[PDB]
Amino acid sequence: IIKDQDRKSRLMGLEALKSHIMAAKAVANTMKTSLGPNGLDKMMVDKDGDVTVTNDGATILSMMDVDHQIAKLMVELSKSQDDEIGDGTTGVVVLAGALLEEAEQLLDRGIHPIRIADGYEQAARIAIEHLDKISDSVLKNTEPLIQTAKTTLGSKVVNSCHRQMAEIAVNAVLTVADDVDFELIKVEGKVGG
Amino acid sequence: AKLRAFHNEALKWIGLDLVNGKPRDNKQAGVFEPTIVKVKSLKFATEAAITILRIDDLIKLH
Amino acid sequence: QMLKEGAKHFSGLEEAVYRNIQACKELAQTTRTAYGPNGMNKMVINHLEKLFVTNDAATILRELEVQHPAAKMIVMASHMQEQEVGDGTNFVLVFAGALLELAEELLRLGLSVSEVIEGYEIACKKAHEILPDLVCCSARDVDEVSSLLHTSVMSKQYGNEVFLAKLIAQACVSIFPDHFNVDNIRVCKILGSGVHSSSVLHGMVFKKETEGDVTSVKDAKIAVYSCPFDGMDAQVKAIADTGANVVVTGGRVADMALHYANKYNIMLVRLNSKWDLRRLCKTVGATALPRLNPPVLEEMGHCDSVYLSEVGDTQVVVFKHEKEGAISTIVLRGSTDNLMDDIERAVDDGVNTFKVLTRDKRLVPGGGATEIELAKQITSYGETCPGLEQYAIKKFAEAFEAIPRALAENSGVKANEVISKLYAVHQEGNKNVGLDIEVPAVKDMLEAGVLDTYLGKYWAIKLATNAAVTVLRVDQIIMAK
Amino acid sequence: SQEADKCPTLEQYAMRAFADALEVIPMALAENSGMNPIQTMTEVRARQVKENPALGIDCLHKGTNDMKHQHVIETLIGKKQQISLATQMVRMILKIDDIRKPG
Amino acid sequence: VILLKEGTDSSQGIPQLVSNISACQVIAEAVRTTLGPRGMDKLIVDGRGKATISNDGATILKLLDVVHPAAKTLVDIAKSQDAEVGDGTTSVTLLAAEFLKQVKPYVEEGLHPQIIIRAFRTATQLAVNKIKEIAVTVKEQRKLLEKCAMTALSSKLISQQKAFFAKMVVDAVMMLDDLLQLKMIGIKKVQGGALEESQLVAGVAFKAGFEMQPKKYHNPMIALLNVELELLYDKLEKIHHSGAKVVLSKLPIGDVATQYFADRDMFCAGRVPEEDLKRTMMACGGSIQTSVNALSSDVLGRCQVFEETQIGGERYNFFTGCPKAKTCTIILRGGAEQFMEETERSLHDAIMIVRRAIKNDSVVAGGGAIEMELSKYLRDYSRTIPGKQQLLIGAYAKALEIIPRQLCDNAGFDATNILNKLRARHAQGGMWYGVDINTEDIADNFEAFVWEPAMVRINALTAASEAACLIVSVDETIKNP
């Protein structure tokens, strides 16, 4: 008789693939616009009538009405990316979508889901192998450090003085460096100036 | 089913005698048909399938 | 205007017959599957979302939502039959329907309903005369006892242990059957291990509540109480003066009444159903002492064994070994509640069947054998009784052909073939000839063992008959909405 | 892509697709920059294979240019982890072919 | 008029079996994908949000909104499979449904239900027996057990270091080897480092007391406390006067309180999770106390080593070296959560196999290797067993071909080519030839070291088979709304 009551949603066969594709691709296309220094900002106004002009994906997904499971997953990717290192919270989102966008293609060809994961896994394992190959191991190098920091303080509201923020970041890390501990860094914040 | 068991026990000469209604020795009974019939039966029937399976689309039109 | 008010479903003559008969057929066939070792149980779930998996027709009808007038008559037939001997609960049902079916066909032809009843009623008395003559009287005698108990255990879910359930019921009903009574048998469904673990305890089992008390009391002086032990010292102290080392309270007991009964080394048991109290007064000789002040030493029953067994991992007091234990307890064991339910359902039946023996030794070779014989006899009888009744009488017998028909039915054997064969071999092998489902072919039921109680069949014919007849008379009934 | 060829099997088309999904980031840059994503990747993929991967997409000058010189560097963990996270999640969903959600 | 009210949907004859058969088949299919090492997880949502990612049929059938009779029965089967042997939960649920798919084409033709039960019940028996006649009884020995571990990790993401992990599994199973209780072998996954760092702890380990406190204290005297150590010096003194040099307060610890702790030389951590608190209790053997005044000398557990290292920057405490560490904690270290997650899954199963190795000796070729054989022999016995049972038994064997069938599908390999390729290689090699899904091709399990307890297949067959018989027996469904 009635296995699943009402108010549900059962995705079987290509129905599950499709749904995720169109659901993710979309969320991936949304953030994709806010990628890079030219990133397009978004305004997330919840139900309280509060404005939210942010450039970060995690900040946009944390205020976006996400009902679909697939979308929520994309919300956990930017959140995880933002809770570990933070930088590039946008990338992971856009990246995830692209992969899926391509996957669907292979699917409609008759290629089973599991298999798609396989290839993407091996390739990824190799994608890193190469990225870790082209790298140029940076040097207590005052020059490169202050630089890398400026590449993170760019396209932001703190870009007007990314130089001062980087300078503090370098010394702060260099001091508590022994393996660097982010705990030995107290960030006191007070109004004034 | 009973035919199969009695077909691999009392050898080939074991078929169904509709008259009586039990696996009987058609060879001993006298039920014999020229093998040529069997050949044509299979051959025709077989070729008959291959063709219909070889049909992906047609066009008869009124 | 309207002959009758609104919301009053009426039916007259044949119009009613068709409806009544039809409703009874579907209801009689529904349980028809629950006949023989091929009995296909059913799952009925009432409002309270309760699942009932039983093979007993009576249990089915008394759990099905029946609102059809005539249909309710079938629930009565199965009810009485279940209260008479238990076995044959489905027998009456199916048969009752077949009768109506053969009768209805007689009316559509032009035959008077009156004659129908007469013919059927007259054949009902003839059969009740044929059965007692054809019946196969058996020998009490543990040898014959197990034989009938062994033929009443099959056809159920506990057929895997038809040998155990046979001896278990053979021992119980053979320790206090003065005039045996099915009420002196207390069955307990304890979960744990297979049914091949069922034991026979000579007494009554229950559940105590105190630990520090004597778990295993020797010659105990049981004192059945009903008044609560709440306030507690003078109450429990007045029980130690009489020498009551075992207290069986009917209601709850105060914590201070337990600690005191726990200090006096007196095994106390609270929350004892009203029936468990009565069964304890007729097994050890205890007196239902209301208040806690009038008890004495002459009100204490003797129970040689009152220990705490944790069989299946659940504590249970076993009041066994008494002077005149008139009530024994059947300790059932099951791996699942499902198997435990079925088993017990069948145990009771056997208890009634045995009760039939103590009041009727006679037995007939079931499996359809007796049915075919009666059909044969009755038919001939009809030919000896001239008049339009000759048709009704023969039709009545043709109904008995529905019993073996159902037998080969729940087995997938062409009735048309098995029946014709059965009769032929039955008219030569006599009564004993029947149908063995386990092996689709005619066989001597008496030899196969399959033997039913004479009295079991007797009532069936009468009850079913009289009942069906009634439902046929009331051919016009509106209501009064 | 080249490694996808050195290794046949159905995983070949997979690796290829994976690579194609590794071009989105750049293509997007050209997109959000205003330059035609396609025409951009045209000069990119070209100027990249010729002058090593040290060249990327300068969304400021609209076109190709050596990143190492433009001082547009990024920690390895950034990209490194990025591929991971995205890959792991997407993989999970791929294994999801049925979700019964009541209520 | 009218038997049943407008609501008692009566399904008898065949319209009852069908419906119950179709749903059971569909429910099974749902989990039919969670079969194998690369199963298809299912994020079950409880409407309220909480999403649960499971791969086990039981956990899934227990979290889904089941509102169908024949469906709720499947949940029972899964529960009866999960509480008996464990794995195969999805299988038994799928098989039972499949067995209803191969019989359906027979019912619709007129094949009597009961008769159907005969064959099915006869087949299951014939099948179960073979499991005891074709089961390979293997041998203990740290050498063999380690082998049984590498085979459990091979063809996986951990295979990269399955050599080291296999050892940890064996030791973790050897240490607490008193019938090995999986509920005692803990697995601690913590991101940071490389799989080449994961080690086996002879106790437990948690994720401080003071910057530079006794990092690695010799023999500790565990002092667990539920209450917080905040308002102070009174409580700290009580701990010192008890000999407790190691305290673990479930709640935050006072700033100053921490000071006197570093002075009296006593390692004490604050905000210790409830679960962890219990672990230490089952580890070094420390008793949990709510109040600090209830802590006595007989409440201070004992351990061999206690060190605090920064595995990934975050200092971690270890509780290794317990007198009777009947609750070990496998510390795992890795790069990301994923890799570490998979690791916790590979080892989990690995422990299972190593477990069933020390327990049940008789094993069999998994990967549906036994199924292919059974399906073969069963087909033969068909010829030997003519009549109805013949054709049926054959179809029964055909069904058993679903285990290996879906096995390949749950990876991406063609079910046809393999199935046929299996039957061929099977009828030439032996009863060991199965289907190495990890390689998507047939292979000998004896050499592929792919084994599983003889019980598994047995517990599945019977339970799964009998289930179908139920839905088949009950030829009618009434409820009474």
The string of DSSP codes covering C315-356 is -EEEEEEESS---EEEEEEESSHHHHHHHHHHHHHHHHHHHH
Binding residues of C: 35-36, 87-91, 154-156, 367, 452, 457
β-pairing verdict for C433-436 and C441-444: antiparallel
Distance from C-alpha of E469 to C-alpha of E24, rounded to nearest angstrom: 13
- Percent helix, percent strand, percent coil in chain A, to nearest 5: 55, 5, 40
Q: Is E110 annotated as a binding residue?
A: no
Tokens encoding C355: 């009760």
Would the CA dihedral through E258, E261, E267, E268 be positive or negative? negative
Distance from C-alpha of E97 to C-alpha of E115, rounded to nearest angstrom: 19
Would the CA dihedral through E295, E297, E299, E305 be positive or negative? positive
Distance from C-alpha of A106 to C-alpha of E309, rounded to nearest angstrom: 47
Q: Do E390 and B8 touch (CB under 8 A)?
A: no
Strand partners for E187: E330
Distance from C-alpha of B9 to C-alpha of B18, rounded to nearest angstrom: 20
| Chain B CA closest to residue E388 | B1
Q: Do E479 and C30 touch (CB under 8 A)?
A: no
Tell me the CA distances in angstroms from C221 to C240, C244, C276, C322, C390, one per residue in order: 10, 5, 17, 11, 68
Amino acid of residue E90: T
* Residue E289 half-sphere exposure toward CB, CA atoms < 13 A: 24
Distance from C-alpha of C46 to C-alpha of C51, rounded to nearest angstrom: 7
Q: ∠E397-E400-E403 over CA atoms, to 5°? A: 160
| Residue C446 near residue C370 (C-beta atoms within 8 A) | no
> Which ranges of E101-254 would DSSP assign to H, the alpha helix?
104-107, 113-133, 142-153, 162-175, 233-240
Tokens encoding E250: 């479930």
Smallest Cβ–Cβ distance between D97 and the set E40, E48, E336 belongs to E40
- C21: nearest Cα among C86, C99, C78, C132: C99
Cβ-Cβ contacts under 8 Å for E39 (sequence gap 6 or more): D95, E33, E55, E90, E410
Element (H, E) at C306: strand C301-309
Contact B2/E at CB under 8 A: yes
**Structural biology method used:** X-ray
Q: Do A81 and D92 touch (CB under 8 A)?
A: no
- A184: nearest Cα among A174, A176, A192: A176
Length of chain A: 193
Distance from C-alpha of C338 to C-alpha of C52, rounded to nearest angstrom: 9
DSSP designation for C300: P
| Radius of gyration, CA atoms only, chain B | 18
Distance from C-alpha of E418 to C-alpha of E407, rounded to nearest angstrom: 10
Decide: helix, strand or coil at residue C8: coil
The number of beta carbons lying within 10 Å of the beta carbon of residue C123 is 28
Distance from C-alpha of A1 to C-alpha of B40, rounded to nearest angstrom: 50
* Residue A96 half-sphere exposure toward CB, CA atoms < 13 A: 39
State the greatest distance between any 2 C-alpha atoms of chain E, in Å, as a whole number: 92
| Residue C350 near residue C431 (C-beta atoms within 8 A) | no
Would the CA dihedral through E373, E379, E380, E385 be positive or negative? positive
Mutation site for A-interface testing, chosen from D87, D95, D98, D101 by largest number of A Cβ within 10 Å? D87
Residue with tokens 């959560």: E337
| Residue C319 near residue C222 (C-beta atoms within 8 A) | yes
| Residue E465 near residue E92 (C-beta atoms within 8 A) | no
| Radius of gyration, CA atoms only, chain C | 27
Cβ-Cβ contacts under 8 Å for E303 (sequence gap 6 or more): E203, E219, E220, E222, E283, E284, E319, E320, E321, E322
Smallest Cβ–Cβ distance between E473 and the set C19, C40, C412 belongs to C40
Tell me the CA distances in angstroms from E309 to E120, E283, E312, E313, E316, one per residue in order: 61, 19, 9, 9, 5
Tell me the CA distances in angstroms from C162 to C153, C446, E121, one per residue in order: 5, 18, 19
Residue with tokens 């044949």: C14
β-pairing verdict for C246-248 and C220-224: parallel
> Which ranges of E333-368 would DSSP assign to H, the alpha helix?
337-358
Tokens encoding E44: 């079950």
Extended strands (E) in chain B = 15-17, 22-24
E378-417 burial code (b ≥16 CB/10 A, e <16): beebbbebbebbbbbbbbbbebbbbbbbbbbbbbbbeeee
Would the CA dihedral through E447, E453, E455, E460 be positive or negative? negative
Amino acid of residue E219: N
Distance from C-alpha of C85 to C-alpha of C353, rounded to nearest angstrom: 6
CB contacts, 8 Å: A103 with chain D: 17, 90, 94
Amino acid of residue C439: V
Q: Do A35 and D25 touch (CB under 8 A)?
A: yes
DSSP D43-72: HHHHHHHHS-TTEEEETTTTEEEEHHHHT-
Tell me the CA distances in angstroms from C202 to A120, C14, C149, C181, one per residue in order: 73, 58, 19, 16
Q: ∠C177-C78-C10 over CA atoms, to 5°? A: 155
E40-50 burial code (b ≥16 CB/10 A, e <16): bbbbbbeeeee
Nearest CA-CA distance, residue A169 and chain E, Å = 19
Decide: helix, strand or coil at residue E424: helix
Amino acid of residue E471: I
Distance from C-alpha of E326 to C-alpha of E180, rounded to nearest angstrom: 10
- Cα C117 to chain centroid, rounded: 30
End-to-end CA distance of chain B: 47
Q: Do B5 and E384 touch (CB under 8 A)?
A: yes
Decide: helix, strand or coil at residue C225: strand
Cβ-Cβ contacts under 8 Å for E317 (sequence gap 6 or more): E205, E206, E207, E208, E269, E306, E307, E308
Amino acid of residue C278: R
- A5: nearest Cα among E43, E59, E62, E65: E65
**Chains D and A share 3 or more Cβ pairs within 8 Å:** yes
Nearest CA-CA distance, residue D97 and chain E, Å = 7
| Residue A39 near residue A86 (C-beta atoms within 8 A) | no
| Residue C371 near residue C419 (C-beta atoms within 8 A) | no
Strand partners for E435: E442
End-to-end CA distance of chain D: 46
Q: Do E30 and D84 touch (CB under 8 A)?
A: no
| Residue E24 near residue E1 (C-beta atoms within 8 A) | no
Residue E76, class by beta-carbon neighbours within 10 Å (0-12 exposed, 13-18 middle, 19+ buried)?
A: middle
| Chain C CA closest to residue E107 | C412
Tokens encoding A44: 């997330």
CB contacts, 8 Å: D10 with chain E: 412
Q: Do E40 and D98 touch (CB under 8 A)?
A: yes
Residue with tokens 């929520």: A72
Tell me the CA distances in angstroms from E173 to C408, E110, E196, E358, E453, one per residue in order: 57, 55, 20, 9, 17
Distance from C-alpha of C429 to C-alpha of C446, rounded to nearest angstrom: 11
- A165: nearest Cα among A176, A149, A189: A149
Amino acid of residue A149: A
A137-148 burial code (b ≥16 CB/10 A, e <16): eeeeeeeebbbb
Cβ-Cβ contacts under 8 Å for E372 (sequence gap 6 or more): E400, E401, E404, E422, E423, E426, E433, E434
Chain A residues 162-191 with a CB less than 8 Å from chain D: none
- Positions of E marked catalytic: 56, 89-90, 349
Residue E37, class by beta-carbon neighbours within 10 Å (0-12 exposed, 13-18 middle, 19+ buried)?
A: middle
Residue with tokens 């024994």: C328
Distance from C-alpha of E112 to C-alpha of E97, rounded to nearest angstrom: 19
Residue C70, class by beta-carbon neighbours within 10 Å (0-12 exposed, 13-18 middle, 19+ buried)?
A: buried
Q: What are the residues of chain E with a beta carbon less than 8 Å away from any beta carbon of chain A? A: 19, 23, 26-27, 38, 40, 43, 45, 47, 51, 64-69, 71, 310, 313, 410-412
Cβ-Cβ contacts under 8 Å for B53 (sequence gap 6 or more): none
Would the CA dihedral through A127, A128, A129, A135 be positive or negative? positive
Distance from C-alpha of A61 to C-alpha of A82, rounded to nearest angstrom: 12
